Amino acid sequence: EFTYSYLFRMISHEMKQKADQKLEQLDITNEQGHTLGYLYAHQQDGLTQNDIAKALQRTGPTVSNLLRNLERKKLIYRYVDAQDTRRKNIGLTTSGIKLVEAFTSIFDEMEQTLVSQLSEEENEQMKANLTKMLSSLQ
Amino acid sequence: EFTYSYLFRMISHEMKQKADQKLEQLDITNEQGHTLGYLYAHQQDGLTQNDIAKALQRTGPTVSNLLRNLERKKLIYRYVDAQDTRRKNIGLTTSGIKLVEAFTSIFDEMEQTLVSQLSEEENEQMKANLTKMLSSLQ
DNA sequence: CGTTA
DNA sequence: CGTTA
Hints:
DNA-binding, Arc Repressor Mutant, subunit A
């Protein structure tokens, strides 16, 4: 009944939907999620609003609003740079980190769900076949 | 070796890549493709630049530039509305239509490629299993 | 987004 | 986009 194109598109759609749904359960928007995820990946650096704006490709006022909201939840903290009064550095709080890790947990959760649908032998065959299909598109 | 998450993501990636590649062969950008596709879907209406801007969620100057380029190739034509001097209607030319249909042909082409990778019996099983996996995410 | 980009 | 959103 279904074409492969429909199935692959729909599977991807639902995987995205699950992620969206996880963000909703954590009371954050997609964009807030992206901001926190980028902070997570660059915790070591000492990031500013401008860095985030460039990375997310969003205007300054938009990132200011996002950060204001994230800080109001204390998922982030901001402080004046000791060498530059005009610069505010941004970090994740303990809870910010926990929220990001809770969000990203959904990837393995979905993998585990997909894997549990088939017998071990069926999974091996399915992966082989998907691997062949993937090759045929390359 | 590969997770299902990697395979489904990569298959979707390549399918998108094939579409991009088709646009390149037809000498149009993604955005130009989107504009022509929207015109195709609304050939019956008498569309203006403003309609297209709202639909594509792009600024007016951007759509003006897109239309200028599409018209320079004569993939579209524009004319002053007989009831409103300030309004220009936009239509696809014969070649504009042919280009869109050539682009969208790539969907069935990829479906046919995917289907040809497996025996008939294997395709039935694969589709069944993908259908189960899709359900498990719903 | 148009259609499944 | 961060990581696979």
